[PDB]
Structures are given as structure tokens and as C-alpha cells.
DNA sequence: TGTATTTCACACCGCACCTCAGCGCGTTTTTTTTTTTTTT
DNA sequence: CCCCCCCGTGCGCGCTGAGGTGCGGTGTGAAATACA
């Protein structure tokens, strides 16, 4: 009986963080219980073309958002959504069970968060079956990172990912790999900026986000990988996790991670400057 | 009042579930015999947006309720769908006729069903014409899940359809593709996040879902395949199939299959949470 | 003076089956000598858009209605549209020709039409310009399918001319074409669905149609293709069809198999016993 | 005397035959200076969506109205577009010089363009450098239809070309091109349609148009084409016309073709009834 | 602040010559400072739109005026256009040094610029840095022409350019690029019409505009081009202009080839009847309004 | 009266330099607190449409207003923009370690800026890590200048990029690189017009911006390439420079390069600007 | 009884409100393109 | 000879013009108050 407000279903739309099509659409629809401007939706003839604006602006909204966050807020932000309890005793543990001390894990993960060039790599490079798909694909789990898929590299767009991510991950790479990051993104793996080509739109000259790669091969040995030697830092993941116990003796979840970060907040050299001190608001675009 | 109303035939097409434009069209054109707001459309000067808007809205509305839906509420539609005549007797006869139990097969369908790691895929092998394509093809189809082809796995969209349906099927895998399995796509058989493209669109990172091969080649004795044997469930068919006038001694209906899995709703220990609303109206707020 | 009415000019395209944008424009545009509406649609200040959604309204009518339209009803309504006049005796007498019974060619359309798993391709056997490609596609052409190209097998997307037509046929499979059969198709012979793939789009998954294949193989001698013996009834063209001293004197115009249908429904074991009313309510779908 | 009138644009645009968006925008423009519709289309201010739609109303009538047209009528077209005057003289001694006599090409043109299957290829099949290119070429450009090629065999997409055009041409047809002729493209001279792979299209179900074929290889001779010997109409080229000699290197322009037809209606049976005797034609 | 007037604004586009959006949108909103109908358009809601609008108009207008000009008088006005004080001397020393007349160089642009097919292209083929590519661009920048790229034969965009342009230019032929002037662009070297797919709206029935090609191969020799061979006019280019060792090499000029056209008008038979009527004693304004 | 004024939108937009789509629309809605015109934008029903046309506009107004620059001009505007503290006494002692005198290197580059024909590609070729990437990638850095990659080039609208800047560079070319410079970029690099194609927009035949590329591969020595040795420059470099961990004296900063400039405004031949007599030109508005 | 001194009373003429719907209204690269690997 | 359930809401941003209705800027007097 009012006249519809697309902002007001835009900022409701970002309270819940819906942004494709079909989830805004289904779930306003069944939240137009209690909501006038849901029911002044429905009896309107453009509904289609309303959803599509409203994704694609909640899309704006939150990606801008992530894009402006430094990395401390950003890890905070992040910090406020590990739900879960566990310590940060499996972490130590499991480097133990690999004969890895901690502190020089520490040292290179201090580095590889600033994207410091020249260290912005690393890599576990192990046999099959040691623990390292498992602890890799976990962190960036937590990191919130996009997992990059060698399959379709001859298509150029399987890079696109790059453009948005904080800490994409490439899994079980081949010698074809490790040739193609000598090759073609020397830039990257450096930590210099390099171009980006996306899809129906413009390409994005970005920074080179962190990275990690898990592979079988060992690139501190092959002497025709000359160029990776001091380009990467190589962990080794010797002995076998999937042994004899039961279940995976040694299994990581965001609790892990969590209080990994809130107890490690300062040897990794994280701080925010200096305003913390005020009750939550936020972007509104309602009125 | 004549004035049309696009809620009302967004309503009523998702009332009988045409979501393509054509049926849409001709179906409502039809109905305008007895439906104001349909002698309202005929005359509308913009018909074909209005089918347009009328199609995408009534897509987005199904696509969005069925992805809301966890596992046993989808196969409880699965088999609300399910109509004819038949019992799991005309399947665990095929399966003795085989000289397989069932309560093995079971004891592996649970798992397969819930997705847990490092046991989902079945491999069924068998020499050509004992029944594999049978048995599978039937399974699939009554878990509305899309079959692969690795005819196309030169171009690398052929994952695609790996986006929406959740049981893939993978039918006849030659010694390519059990390479390509034991390289590329180990994750999938893990449970590991995979990143699969669209067509014109981007790579959506998803949970790689249950999957479900045939193939002659025996993984868990090769030794090229040494890192699959923990990844794949295998069955062996071997007594003979089809040859005898065009009728296969043995054809699974989904009557059987709807009879199977209502009859062992306790063993596959399929079920839904407290519960006080099941069979009441459904919420049809779309309009 | 006169308002426009989009749909009355819909029911007066739909009228004439008028299909393409052009063809609309043109006649519409003549017919605005006596047509009010159509003098409305000239003074129309966006004459453009008026005809593309025409276009598009009455495809939208028309694949529809092709697509609702039950085996039976279909072959009723591609009987109707076959223009000529002839006979089915052309076909029974290139048969005996053939030394072929016709009973035989009936006893494998009566199951080639239904659809039922492995007896759903007919394929024609004998060595060339023996009257194979004759039979096939005229009786394709008939059926209104769409004849297949088996050279292009080398791209996937040879397989999306299947995505709409009821009917399909592949020249001349040489032994390329019975690997691919073999090898990919295994399921479309059983009538179960399978998985097709177009150019610059997504695959979808749809019943695999009935199937017409021509061949100089003899499959169900071969022994590679002993699992495409219980898919396939062969049909051996042996004699020469065409010219005995210069003129060929076998040829199957539409009338012919229109005929042959005609005489052949109970045969053919299918019903169009309608007669409703006079022939059909066929009201209006304006 | 105000509110720019659409239609009237669109029917003066076809009136003139301005198809293309440029020309039409541009002289519409320049005759605003004494047209008060055109002064109210200039101070509009969505211009450019009426030039986009006149140009694709004015494309819409013309294309069909060429397609609507019949051969007699197309013909009877095409034999006053021809622009210049020639005389049949040069065809007839270019046909008496290659000793076939031109009663022959009127016999068999007869037939080919009725696009009677059994009769619906010509051959003119000679020694390198003896004219046959030249006047296949010449006919076929008279007729305006599309010349294949078949340089672009290692492909099936040299067919997509042939998709509007009522005739074709292929130029020095290597056994390659008969082979593929005798293959692929079987049902084009038997009369059934046959389909067409193109790039980024579909197989489009189109009836063959009358063809035209330039080689060196007599296929009226060979034993391993059998299947061409009764559909085609095969012509001898023995001597030499297109050298470079102090005479004429016999030159057949369109004016030839004109005068050809216009002399040859009667001996080539094209029918002239269903006309509409000079009724105009409009778009308001 | 009045109603804003889009054909004032497109006047005043074609006015100044600014064609594409960027200049026309960035340049008008600078001239606010005197221009009420550049207010106008700056008060609107839909600026966006309307440089489209206006883009599109001049680009219309410039198209058609450039076409409708005749050969003849077009090199009138690319001899216009050329200032300087430039002689022939140094075209006639550059062939003459290839040991090839300049009288073949002119018997062959006569029938050249005419576009009689079959000679419809001239192919300067010799080794790299002979002094090929330079005379064929100094002509092609005096003619106005575009000059065309092969590295991007794929997307099928590459031939927009000779829709409109009276003398197009590939240069670094390859051996693909003589594959496409062999099975694609036969209709240009024999005069037929091509359709040239320009990349927003409808392709065109335009002809094909002479054309200029430098290369190492010579397709008079390649049998793999029998259709190349007799529908190109080679001019061989073997005596290089590569000194490193001393005095400046030859370079061509834009007064250059306007002494030359100057000199040798009566030479090269350009002559178009006249222009005397009354159409244009002195009507000029024809603009627009 | 509180109705949106796009112009305002539009001239705000540039005056903060704010151009892709997602930062103007987050930062317009949270300046919708304090700017009566973006509180009035946040009611519209159309915001995305607004957004994308305010996008569209600044870089018209940006892209226009750049290219009008006459090139000591560009200089002069970066000089001024360039902030931090640093002197030209780092590049020459940088160079004059290289053994390079630094009079060769200006009386090369006073020809690179101007696009002088057949000086137009100013190549740094030396062994592997000598301190070519550091110094080429800061000099882009200055110029405003675009670095392309070369992965992209199954692509060919990976040059996109070269239709608006005045400054290019690709590091790291491989030998296809060097293949496909002297076979397709023969007249660009001559110093003849090239076309080049764009995403959905019109292709323009344009100069060719000057270049900067590095490799470890010569191209003035290789015989394969007998057609670059008189179009390109050429610098050896080869003493061990390229650590930045040990002891790093090639760390190149921006202000290296302004009083670079700033000392050498007379043996670069660039005092002619587009400021040679400049008296008055304090203006700016885009309303 | 003659006459200064003033709002109600029917209204010139209206400033300006609200009231409808006939005028404007839209995206298309990327993949596929046959190109030369990709075992042999 | 009187109560055991039908019922899930409102529209192209924006105009804008004839239409007529009213309390007043101004229509401006015979009646009406009080004077002398």
C-alpha cells in the first residue's frame, strides 16, 4: 500500500549478505510476511529487472568493501567469523610430527602475509599422502582464498581469479606448472604488479596476492629451475599424516587457525593504529 | 479490474512448473479463456518482456528452492516424484544374480550418499555386456543427477554440468580418464573445494559432489594407480546380461528404486531434524 | 483515429505463418491498403519493434506447438502438409525390387516409431547406388527430421542437430562412423537419454530420438560391434535402384509415403480416430 | 506541421533506395533546407534511433521484395539492371570459336535454370587459359550469384556462402572437388535438401541453387564417377581465347548477357503472365 | 539553462571535426563558460546517452561527406591538404636507384588508382630494409588510406577499416596473409564486391578499395598462389637503402609526392569533366542549419 | 527542492579521481551522510544505472583531459606529483658501477621519449638478476605507464592497452616474445601507425607509444634477428647488482627519477614544453 | 430628514492545486575459430 | 428448524493540460449606523 524503495531492499539484501540472483529473488519472496515494502515488490511489474539491480549493487557494495579493508582488519574480520573452539596446539604439533620447527615456519610466514617481493611463495613440496593438501588447503580456507585449478591453462581467463582473492592456491603442480610460473608469471611470483585479463570486461593491473603451491616436485634441487631458487620458500613434508590411527591423526578447522591468529597476533606483526573505541555502524543505504 | 497483474502470472507459472518461455507463451495464450488477467496479457503491447521477466523469475524461484533443500528432504521430493509399479525385490535379484549382497552395498551407499571424504566415488567394473550402464544409469536417473562424458575432456568445459546436479555419473572410463582422475582430479574424489567454469561465466569454486563411474579397468590392481585405491569404493560385475530378443533379463524401474529407499529409510539412516510442520500448505508466496 | 492493437497483429501473423521478421514487415506493410490496424502500424512512430516482438511471439507460438503434439497427432499433421499425388505402390515395388517383403519394412517401422530400446535404428546395408540414400531420405524428408553429417565428427557438435527434430539420418557410416556409435552412443540405441553438446552453449540431456543410418558394413558380421548386434536391424539393398538404361525408375515423392501412411494405420499400429465435431475445435490463439 | 512522421521517413528512404544508415542520415540532413519534416527530424532529440530504424525498415522491404520475386520475374529484373549496351555477337563467336554451337548452351541452359535435378551442373571443362573461367564468371555475375571456391576445402565451411545466392561457381575444381561433389554434396543434384556446416551457425536445410562448374577434368570420362555422368552437362573447351594476342581477347561484359537474353527469351522459356502491370508500391 | 538542443550540439561537433565521445563530451563541458546550450547539457540527467547520440551523428555525417567525393576530386583535396615545399627529384633517385624507371612506376599507378581488376594490387616485394615499406607508407599517409595489421586475422574485425577508406595497406605479409588474399579476399583483386562485416551494426556491399602489400615472398614465383600470380603487379625492390656507413638514406615527404602529382597531372590522366553549373557558384553553408 | 544533480555526482567523482564503478558508488553511499545530493541518490530508483553512467563520464572526462597532454607536459605533471625524498645521485651511481657512463643513457633516452623513428625500443639485456627489473619497472612506474604480460598473446587484445598510454612495457619477454616483435610489430615499431582492437568499442589506428622491454636473451647478437639490430637500443648489463637481500645497492625510488628530471631540464631537449612561456593557467572545472 | 462612514454579500477573475497515460526504455565477448601438438 | 472456514498484496522514473472549485486579491454598491 506504499511505494516500493529499491534501497531499502538493497541495504536488507547486504544485511544478509545475499548477491546472486535466485536467493535474493526466493528469499525476499518469503520474507514478504512482514515487510510492506516486499508486498509493494510483489504487485510490481518489474520485478526481474529490480532483483538484477539489486544484486548487482550489493555485489558493488561488498566488494568494494573487502577491497578497501587493510590486512590487519582484514584478518580481524575474518577472525570474527572462525566459529568454532579449538587451540593452536594442533598447529605446533603437527610441524613436530614433521620435524619442522615452528619458529622458522613462523619467520616465513611473517615475510609471505606483507607480500614482501622475492618471498611471496611458499611452497611444501613432500610425497603423496604426507600433509600438505590438508594444511594448505585449510589456511586458505581461513584466508578466505580461491583455489586456482590448472586443468583449463590453456585458457588464458584461469587467472581471472587473481583479480579479487587475498590467497589463491594452485594444488599438485606438474613440471608443465612449475615451467609455466618460470615462464609466464615471473612478475608474479615475484610479487611485482602483472596484468590481469578477465572476462567480458576490461583487464586489471593488479599486485601479485600471496600464494601457496603444494607440489611432488622439489624446484631447490632441479638446477635447470635456477631462477626458483631464491624466488620461493620450500618446506619439506617428509612423513606420512594418513598413518596407521584410525581417523587422520592430524585434521585442522578454523578454531585451529582462530586462536592461532588471536595468540600469534603479534610475532606475525599485525596491529591496527589506533581507533577501536566506538559502538558498530555501518554503510546504510536505505533512508 | 483489466489491468494486468505480473505477480498473478509469475503465480501460476510456477503454479505448474513451466519455467522455458515457449510453454509459457502457449500455455498462457491457452489459458486466456477463462483468466481476466490472461485477455489482459493478449492485449498488452509488450508481451514478449513480459514472458522474458515471467520465465527468469519463475527460474530463479526454482533453481533457489531447490539448492535450499539438504539431502533427505531432496530425495524425500526425489521419491514424491516417483510413480509405478515395482519393489526391490526386481533389484537385489539383479544383485544375487550377480552374486553381490546388498548389505555391502548399502554400508557403502551410506557413506557415498553423505559425501565423507575419501569414500565418494563408486566404481562399478565389468567386462562389456554384464550390466553396469544398466544398474548405473537407473540410479542416476532417479537421483535427477547429471551423466559426464569424457568425449569432450579436450575442451575443458565438459565439467560444467558439475555445477548443479548432485550425484555425476561417468560412464565407460578408459585408461585416459582414470589418468585424468588420478592427476587432475583428485580433489573431487578427496572432497576438496574444485573450480569449475561455466560456459560464459565464471568459475564457480564448489564442493565437488558424489560421483559414480563404470568402468573395464580394475584401479585397485594396477599399480600406476597406487594413489586412487584410497579414494574409490569398487563393485565387481561379472554374470552375464543383456543378449536374449532386445529385453534385458533385468530393467530397475523407479518404483523399485522409490520402494528401495522408502523401505530402508533406517539403514541408509536418512532423516530430518525436530519436525512440526511436514504435510501442511506449502508456501506458495510468490505472487 | 484508430489505436494500434499488438494482438490482432499477432493472430493476423499467426494466421499466415509468417515466421520471419522480414516476410511481416513486408505483406503487413501491403496489407495496410484495407487492414485499419495496419494504416495504425505505418503512422506508428516504432514500426521496428512492433515487428521483432511479432517475430518472436509467433515462433514462441509455433515451436510450441510442434513441440505438444503426440506421435501419433504429428504424423497426422505431416500428412496433411505433403503435397502431391502418387502412390504407396512405388515403395512396395522398389521393395520386391529389393527382394525385400514389405512386411518385413513394416515389422521394423512398427517398433523403429514406438521408441523401444535396442530396436530403435534401421540401418540399410549395400554396396552404393543401390537405392540406399533414396528410401532414407525420402523417408527422412517425410518425417520432417534433419539429416546428420557424419564428417564432422572430428568436432562434438555434430550431435546438436538432434536437440529438436524427431527423426535423424547419417549417410554413408563408414567405419569411423560405427566406432563412434559404438564407442559414445551406446546409449541413444538403448533409448536411454544422453548427453548432447551445441557450439557455444550448454549441453542438455534429452531422449535420444529414433535413428535412420546408412552404411556399407555389414555390423552384424563384424565382431568389434558385438555389443551394436542387439541395437541395429539391418536391411540389405542389393539390387541397383537406379537407372536399368539411363533413367532412374524408382522415386518416393511425398504422396507416396503419404499414401502408404494412410492405407497403413492399423498396420502401423497408431490411432487418429478423432473426428470430433466437423474436423477440429482449432479455435484461436490470438 | 510539427511531430517528424516516422513512416513518412521510412517510405522516402525506400522511395529513393537509401538502404544504408550513413547515406540515409547524412542527404536527410542536407535536404532540411526545403523538407518541414526534416526540419522537425533535426531538432529531435533521439536522431539516431530513427536513422537505425528507417535503415532496418528499408532493409526489411527490400530484402524481401527481392526475395519474393520469382525467376521469370527475377530475370526479367536482372535483364534491365544490366546497365550499358552489347550485343550477342562476341557470345555467339566466342561459343562458334570453341566449336560448340550455341543452340547447345540453349538446350542445356533450358534446364539448368529450372533447377530440374538430373540436369543441374554444366561442366566447362578445357586446357588451362581457354576462356572457361572467364565466361562462367561473366554468366554468373549476370545472374548475380555468389562464386565458391573450393581453395577452402580443408574446411567443410566453404558451403556457408551459398546460403542467399540463386547460383554458384567453382573455380578449376581439382579432383578434390569432384571427389567431394561425388561424396558430400550428393543430394544437391539429385533435388533433396541437403544440410550446410558453417562457423557459428547451424546446419540450415536449404534447396540447392542451380551450380556452375570450371575444371580440367572431363568427369563424363572417368570411370570412378558414375554417379556424375547423367547429372551433369559437361562442355568442350579446346581452343584459346584469353591470350594476349593483337586481336580481342574476346571480352563478354553484362550488356552481352542482356542483349543474350533479351534475343533468347523465346528459345529459353521463361513465362510472363502474373504481373501486376505497373502497380507502384509504397510504405506510407 | 534552456532546453537543451542535441542538433545544436551536433553542430557544433561536426563544426570543430571532434569525433569521438571522449573529446566531444570532455571538450564541450570546458566550453560552458559561454555556450548556454553547453549549460543546458550540463544540467541534464542523461549526459551519457547523448554523447553516444552525438558520436554516432558525426561519425554518420563524416562518413558520407568523405564518400560522396570523387576520385578525381579526392586527390584534389589530398593535394590540398599537403603543404610544403617538396620536389620529385627524390621519388624519381629512389627508383631509379632500384634500377626500376619511373615510367613503370607511373604506367602502373594510372591503372592502378582506376581499380581495373585484375590489377587491382601492387606488391612490393624485396628483402627486408630496401626501402619497401618506406615509399608504400609515405604514399598511403599522402592518400589518406588505412593502413591495415595482420597480427589480429582472428575476430574477423580487421576488415572494418577498408569499408570507408580509399587505399588500405598490409604490411609484414606473411605467408597467412597471402593464404587469406588467396582463399578470402579473391573478390578484391577481381574487382567483384566483398562484404565487409563492420563490428556493431550490418556488414557492407562495398567494394574493394585499391590495395598496397609488402612482402619478402614473391608470389610471382610461390606456385601456391596461381590465382596471386596474374592479379598483382610486383615491383622488385632488391638495391637497399640500409646505409649505417655515412649519408642520410632517401625519406619521402608529403610535398614530396604533392610536387610530384603537380608535375606529372597531365602524365597521369586525372580529369574529371569540370564544375561550373549552378550548383556551386558559391553555396557553402550546406553544413547544416 | 532535493532532487539529484548528476552533474554534481559527476564533477565530485573527478575531483577525487574516483573512476571504477565500485569505489564511487561505496564511498558516494557513505558520503550520502553529509552530501545532500548523495542522501538524495540513495532514494533513486535507478542507482546501478546512475553509478555506471557517473563511471562512464569520469573516464570520459579523465581519458580526454590526458591525452590532450603534450609529452614534456605529461613529464612536467608527474614531476610536480611526485612526493618523497630522494636525489638523481642514486641512478648515477647505479649506472656508473654498471660501467655505463651515464652520458650514454641520457643521449638514448633524449631520443626514446620523443618516439623517434627507429630508436623507438630501449631494451636492458644482461645476464640472469643484474638489476634491470628494479630500474625498468620503477621508470614505468613514474611515467604512468602500463606493463602488459605475455601470457595473454593467444589473445591479440592483450594490447589493448597501448591506445592510451605513453610509456609500455613487457618484462620478461620469452623468445616468442622476440619472435612475434619482429614479425607482427614490424611498422609500430618502425615508427608507423598499427592498429589496435578493443573490447567492445571501436579500433583506432594510433601511433605506438614508446617501449621499454628487459630480457636475458640479445637481440643484437643473435643472427636469427639480422632485422632488429638497427631498430632497437641496446644496454649490457652485467655486474652482480640484482640481490635487494644482501646488500641492495640498485633500491630505486620514485624521487630518484623526479630530480632526475628536475637536474636534467637541459640535455634531455625538453624545455620546449606545452608550459614554454607560462604566465597564467590556474583553471579547473568540469561541472 | 440629509449625509459622513463601513462590513456583509454575489462575484470578476484566479493562483494553483490534484488527476491520467501516451510519449521516451535492451544486450552480443568469448569461444570456436582449424589452427599444429597432443601419444604415434 | 438453525452456524464445525470462504480470505496470500497492488502497478514504468517523469510530465502535463484541460477542468472547475473556492476563499481572496481585489468587484465596489445598495442597505445600514450613526451624525446633526
Known amino acids: 500500500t506504499e511505494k516500493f524503495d529499491f534501497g531499502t531492499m538493497v541495504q536488507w539484501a547486504y544485511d544478509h549478505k545475499y548477491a546472486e540472483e535466485s536467493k535474493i529473488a526466493y528469499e525476499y519472496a518469503l520474507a514478504?510476511?512482514?515487510?510492506?515494502?516486499?508486498?509493494?515488490?510483489?504487485?510490481?511489474?518489474?520485478?526481474?529487472?529490480?532483483?538484477?539491480?539489486?544484486?548487482?549493487?550489493?555485489?558493488?557494495?561488498?566488494?568494494?568493501?573487502?577491497?578497501?579493508?587493510?590486512?590487519?582488519?582484514?584478518?580481524?574480520?575474518?577472525?570474527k567469523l572462525a566459529?568454532?573452539?579449538?587451540?593452536?596446539?594442533?598447529?605446533?604439533?603437527?610441524?613436530?610430527?614433521?620435524?619442522?620447527?615452528?619458529?622458522?615456519?613462523?619467520?616465513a610466514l611473517k615475510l609471505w602475509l606483507k607480500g614482501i617481493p622475492k618471498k611471496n611463495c611458499l611452497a611444501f613440496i613432500g610425497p603423496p599422502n604426507t600433509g600438505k593438501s590438508m594444511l594448505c588447503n585449510s589456511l586458505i580456507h581461513f584466508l578466505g582464498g580461491s583455489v586456482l585449478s590448472f586443468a583449463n591453462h590453456k585458457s588464458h581467463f584461469w587467472?581471472?581469479?587473481?583479480?579479487?582473492?587475498?590467497?589463491?592456491?594452485?594444488?599438485?603442480?606438474?613440471?608443465?606448472?612449475?615451467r609455466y610460473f618460470d615462464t609466464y608469471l615471473r612478475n608474479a611470483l615475484d610479487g611485482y604488479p602483472v596484468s590481469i585479463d578477465r572476462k567480458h570486461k576490461a583487464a586489471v593491473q593488479i599486485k601479485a596476492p600471496p600464494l601457496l603451491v603444494t607440489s611432488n616436485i622439489d624446484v631447490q634441487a632441479e638446477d635447470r629451475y635456477l631462477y626458483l631458487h631464491s624466488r620461493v620458500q620450500t618446506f619439506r613434508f617428509e612423513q606420512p599424516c594418513t598413518?596407521?590411527?584410525?581417523?587422520?591423526?592430524?585434521?585442522?578447522?578454523?578454531?585451529?587457525?582462530?586462536?592461532?591468529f588471536v595468540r600469534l597476533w603479534g610475532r606475525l606483526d599485525l596491529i591496527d593504529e589506533e581507533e577501536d573505541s566506538e559502538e558498530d555502524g555501518d554503510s546504510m543505504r536505505t533512508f
Open 83 to 107: 566459529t568454532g573452539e579449538g587451540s593452536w596446539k594442533s598447529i605446533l604439533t603437527f610441524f613436530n610430527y614433521q620435524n619442522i620447527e615452528l619458529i622458522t615456519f613462523i619467520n
Open 243 to 260: 598413518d596407521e590411527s584410525g581417523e587422520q591423526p592430524f585434521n585442522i578447522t578454523d578454531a585451529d587457525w582462530k586462536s592461532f
Open 159 to 178: 587467472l581471472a581469479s587473481l583479480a579479487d582473492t587475498r590467497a589463491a592456491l594452485v594444488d599438485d603442480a606438474t613440471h608443465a606448472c612449475w
Open 32 to 79: 514478504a510476511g512482514s515487510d510492506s515494502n516486499a508486498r509493494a515488490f510483489l504487485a510490481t511489474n518489474s520485478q526481474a529487472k529490480h532483483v538484477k539491480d539489486c544484486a548487482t549493487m550489493v555485489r558493488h557494495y561488498l566488494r568494494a568493501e573487502t577491497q578497501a579493508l587493510s590486512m590487519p582488519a582484514y584478518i580481524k574480520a575474518r577472525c
